[PDB]
Each structure stands twice: as structure tokens, then as C-alpha cells.
Ligand binder design. Structure first.
Ligand SMILES: [Ca+2]
Ligand SMILES: [Cl-]
Ligand SMILES: [Cl-]
Ligand SMILES: [Cl-]
Ligand SMILES: [Cl-]
Ligand SMILES: [Cl-]
Ligand SMILES: [Cl-]
Ligand SMILES: [Cl-]
Ligand SMILES: [Cl-]
Ligand SMILES: [Cl-]
Ligand SMILES: [Cl-]
Ligand SMILES: [Cl-]
Ligand SMILES: [Cl-]
Ligand SMILES: [Cl-]
Ligand SMILES: [Cl-]
Ligand SMILES: [Cl-]
Lengths: 225, 225, 225
């Protein structure tokens, strides 16, 4: 009925396990597209698994690092780590590559891409609120924490590459921002302003509208390419 | 009148905002001299701003990292971050480059250089005292913390370069120490010995005399080159 | 008399200072074998000393980093740092290179190598127990912490090389595990399972048997090469 009542239910959907699985699937799919990733999974399977954990949990690793917490604190969530490990195994080692074939099917892939953006926006907002809890007026800390929560492994791409034996120092995601990195920066500014009370909008409405923006952009970008 | 009475007033001058501004101005001037820095400020303005934040607050980032605190804890000091951002903007984007012209004027630049050394020595001593508060007998932790507080961005120069898209691994400030890095190492040893009670001198007198040493050296080095 | 009574005394031998000294000696010997290490000790003695501190305490640096503690927390143990510094000085600067000659004598070197493995296994188990204390069910955190405690400087070899002015990004100890790195991974899994209560064996018996495995392997590998 009411618009705000729909936004409250949208902003409170349980991300675990379905929306988190979509996040893991899309992120590990990107890993498999990277040069040498399939070869690495055969010769260095542990390093391949660690690369996938970076793609799945890099948001929490970077946020915890920025806030001076254990960078692997999120790995105490055993069910999430196991679910992400199952996604890595199925994408790289499923007989007949069947899991890859099913999730790469474009109608299914676009749904996973949309569900991942639901998770990203929730992570941005949680980063801002978590930083605010520790620093009531730490505007720059709120923005940094929300930014790495949304960008994820992209901001540590130079060292994700290093783990794979690759070194390309001529570029990085700060010097040249991809769209998700730049959109996460815009997002963390909006949620920080909403935390300041400067932006006259409820947190649920901002989550709903910014998620729709991300869904439309990413789905369009994915379908086009 | 008394020498110790003058040292107490010298060692307690409010560094914010005037002495901190001089620190920011000199540090961002060095950034602008680095290869590709002006080009970077045009094409990648956010990364340019982040580079300037490293030059202005790298001392606190490194000390917080060494002590297991949030590496961006100092960015909760909104007024300092805003003042440093204003210095970055004026140095790189002032119409007619006027701010750069005024602060690069040698009589004015030597004053800024001298005021920066006041801030550096205070930061070294604060690092030693802060580490001591957490480790009453942690001599090596006191020396490490005082050292990075004084050296600043120099000790993370390899990764300041990486942010700019530069990689020169054949050298670093530990393998080949510049004068400020080496002088900060001598300084943190002196303040640690003063904390041990081994060195028979008041903390205010050591601040006054070591600051004068730094002022004379840096001013002379700056004027000469 | 009883087997478990012998294991309790074996698993509780005081590692400081004799077993720790053997750890430092073997680790600094490996440092001296690295390319340019003797030259570095002459031209950059401070950086050489820091490299040796990484080889002696890298286990604690990495574990503290993973758990969000001060990475130099272990350097508050002044006696250990001083003992490690004495080993570095004697190995690189002893007149007539006499200390190197005595500890490189194969019968003596094999004893030091065996005593180092006693220290490594104790460090693995302590890492698992320390992580468990903070995360009662953090299986993945227990395994990560035990792993870096056992592997030591090997897992940060790329940045130990960087400190020396070397950059070889085409390989790392995760992508290509050496035997001690792989054995420490097996060890931390066993001690984690023993913490889970899944593995029906006492902690003292596991320490005794896994140490013997490491002693036999490393001594054999050292003697052979
Ligand atoms: Ca911490
Ligand atoms: Cl790549
Ligand atoms: Cl492997
Ligand atoms: Cl979250
Ligand atoms: Cl968060
Ligand atoms: Cl407050
Ligand atoms: Cl440069
Ligand atoms: Cl930009
Ligand atoms: Cl300070
Ligand atoms: Cl400090
Ligand atoms: Cl105490
Ligand atoms: Cl090497
Ligand atoms: Cl030196
Ligand atoms: Cl230990
Ligand atoms: Cl530990
Ligand atoms: Cl619990």
C-alpha cells in the first residue's frame, strides 16, 4: 500500500543465504574470467580459494582494516565462508562445468547481478552506520568505511593480482575508478548525508531508490556486454 | 627570564591551526614537485587529494597502524582534514597559481619550513609518550612509534608512489634514509631515553633544543637548494 | 615411565632462551644466505637488522595483524629482541666470522634446526589456542592464525624482499608453498581439529608427535642439502 511500507520490507530482506549466494556467484564468476584463473585453480587450488574469499569478503576485510579490527573477523561466520567455498568449488570444478553453464545463462545471470546490488547497497549503509557508532561526527571515517564496503575487492585489486603472481602498478581503482567503485563513492556520500540528518529522506527510502539505480545500471551494463 | 620557563612556553604552543597549516603547505608543496603530480590533479583529482592526505597525516596513519589502532583514526578531526584539503585545493587549483606563488616565495617558504619542524618534533615526542602509556617498558615500541610520527609519508613512499601509478622497488627510505628520516630516528632515541629517565634533561628542554637543531638544518638545506 | 608423562614434559620445555636462540640462529643464517645480504649489512645496517627482526618475529607480526592487534606487540619483550639482535650482530659482524663458523658446523647446525622445530610447533598450537580464546567457534580464524605462526616470514617474503630492494611478484609462498609453509598448514589443521574435540588425542601428544615429524623432516632436508 504505502511507499514507505514497501521500502521497509525491501530494506530488511534477509540477505543470507540467497542474496549472499548471488553475491558470491557473480563475484567468483568475475574471478574465473581473470587471466590464468582456471590454470591457477588446477596448479594452486589453495591460492585460488583464497582469491575467491577475497572476492566474496573483501568488503569486510577492508572495512575491518580501516577501523582497526581483525581483517579476518568476518571469517568467524562459518556458514557464509562454507557457502562461498561451495560456490568456488562448483564454478571451477563442477563435472561437465554444469554449474557455470547454469549461472552464466543470461536470464539467470541478470537476476544474480541484480541480487548482488541489493547486497552491495546494504553493505554501504551498514559501513556508514558502523563507523558512525564509533565516531558520532567522523564524517570522513563514515565515508571511507561505506566506500570500501561497496567497492569490495576492487580497491585491493593490485594485491589480488599479486596473490595471482601478477603485478601491474601503472593503474589502480583509485587512480582510475570503475563504475562500481565510483557509484559506491556516490552511495557512501548519500548515506553519510542521511546519517548527518542533512539529507531529508528516510534510510529505507534511500536504500530502495539507490538499490534500484544500481540494479538498473548493472543489469543494463551486463546485458549489453 | 628563566631558560626553562621559555622552553615550557615553546613546547606548549598551539600547533592548530597555524603550525599545522605550515606543515600541510610544505608537505603539499613537495607533492606538487613530484613527477606527474599536476597532471594527476587534473585527470584523477580524488587520488590527488588522497595523496595529499597521506603527506599531511601519514605520521598518524603509520603510528596507528603500528599500535593496532584504526589507521584513519585521525581523520575524525574534521577541522584538520578540512584545513589540509583547503591547502591542497589552493596549491593545485588557485586561479593564476597565486597561492603557490605566495608560499613558494623563499622568505615565506623558510618560515613555513621552520614551523613544520616545530610540528615534527612535537609529533615525535607524542609518539614516544603514547607508546609508553600502552607499554611502560616497551622501549622498541616507543622508538618505532616516535620514528614514524617524525618521518611521516617518507616511510610509506613506495606505496605513495603506487597510488600515483609508480613502482620503484629498488630503493626505500629504510634501505636509504633521507636526512629527515635519519634525524627522526635520532630524535625518537633521545625522547625515549628521556622517557627512561636515563637522559638527565626535562622534556621541554629536549623539545626546544632538538627543534632548534631541526629548524637550523632544514632551513639551511632549503635555502641552499 | 608413561608416554603421556613424557609428552607433558616435552610440550612444556621453556623455549626461552635456548630454544628461541636456536630459532633466531637458524633464521638469521637463512637471511645471510639471501642475495646481497652481507653487502646490505655493510651499507644499510639498520635495514639489515630490521630484516633479521622479520625473520625472528614474523610469526608474531603476522598473527597480530590477522587478529587486529599491534603488529609490533611482541617487541615489548625486550629480552627476546635483544637476544635476536645479538644473534644478528654475531652472524654478520663477528671478528673472523667465528660465530658463523661454529653454528654452521653441520653437527651443531642440525641441533639448532631440530630445536627450531620445537619452537615452530609450539607457536602453531599457541596461535590456534589464542584465536580460539577470542572466537570459540572461529575455525577459519584458528587455522589462519596457527598457519602464520608456523610459517613466519615466508608468508610475507614478497615484502621482506621489498625491504631489501628486491621485487619478484611472479611467485609467492601461497601460490607456491615451500615444505615448511605446507607443513604448517597441515599442522594448524590438526591442532584446530584437536581444539574442536574432533580429533581424539591430547594436546601434549599431538605436540610431541608433530614436532618429531618436523624434526625428522627438517634435519633430513638440512643434512641432504
Ligand atoms: Ca586493533
Ligand atoms: Cl589481471
Ligand atoms: Cl595448493
Ligand atoms: Cl554489512
Ligand atoms: Cl561494516
Ligand atoms: Cl562523541
Ligand atoms: Cl616518484
Ligand atoms: Cl577522480
Ligand atoms: Cl601528535
Ligand atoms: Cl602518537
Ligand atoms: Cl606494566
Ligand atoms: Cl631474494
Ligand atoms: Cl643504516
Ligand atoms: Cl607463541
Ligand atoms: Cl599467537
Ligand atoms: Cl561465543
Amino acid at each position: 500500500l504505502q511507499l514507505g511500507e514497501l521500502a521497509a520490507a525491501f530494506a530488511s530482506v534477509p540477505v543470507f543465504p540467497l542474496f549472499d549466494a548471488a553475491y558470491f556467484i557473480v563475484s567468483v564468476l568475475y574471478l574465473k574470467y581473470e587471466p590464468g584463473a582456471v590454470e591457477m585453480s588446477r596448479k594452486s587450488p589453495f591460492a585460488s580459494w583464497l582469491c575467491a574469499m577475497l572476492h566474496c569478503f573483501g568488503s569486510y576485510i577492508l572495512a575491518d582494516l580501516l577501523l582497526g579490527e581483525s581483517p579476518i573477523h568476518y571469517f568467524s561466520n562459518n556458514s557464509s565462508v562454507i557457502l562461498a567455498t561451495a560456490v568456488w568449488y562448483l564454478i571451477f570444478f563442477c563435472p561437465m562445468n554444469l554449474f557455470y553453464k547454469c549461472v552464466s545463462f543470461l536470464p539467470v545471470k541478470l537476476i544474480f547481478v541484480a541480487m548482488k546490488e541489493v547486497v552491495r547497497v546494504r553493505k554501504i549503509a551498514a559501513g556508514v552506520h558502523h563507523a558512525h557508532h564509533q565516531y558520532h561526527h567522523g564524517w570522513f571515517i563514515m565515508m571511507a568505511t561505506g566506500w570500501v564496503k561497496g567497492s569490495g575487492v576492487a580497491l585491493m585489486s593490485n594485491f589480488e593480482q599479486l596473490l595471482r603472481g601478477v603485478w601491474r602498478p601503472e593503474t589502480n581503482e583509485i587512480l582510475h575508478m570503475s563504475f562500481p567503485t565510483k557509484a559506491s563513492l556516490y552511495g557512501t556520500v548519500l548515506f553519510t548525508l542521511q546519517q548527518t540528518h542533512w539529507l531529508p529522506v528516510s534510510e529505507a527510502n534511500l536504500v530502495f531508490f539507490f538499490t534500484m539505480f544500481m540494479i538498473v545500471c548493472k543489469v543494463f551494463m551486463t546485458a549489453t556486454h
